[PDB]
Amino acid sequence: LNDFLKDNRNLGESVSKIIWLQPVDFLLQLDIELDDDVSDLADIFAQV
């Protein structure tokens, strides 16, 4: 990022502050009912 910011500086402008957003855990509660004739179960988990 520092290398990119150095070579992509416009005339009269600069990045005076770099802020990183912090993660907050988002524990989503989900209840899903499948069809009676499901074939692959690991596939649905990946899709979900």
Binding site: D36, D37, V38, S39
Partner: protein, 48 residues
Amino acid sequence: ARPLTLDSLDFLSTQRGYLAQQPELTYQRNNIRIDKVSALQKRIAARL
């Protein structure tokens, strides 16, 4: 529907027996005799 907690070989026997005895099962749809598995029991087993 495909079994989820049952035996694969046992499940195939139900389906093949269901198809093989179609003439008898529906002709005797409501018949019951002593010492013979009723057609109602066979239909329930095949469906599940």
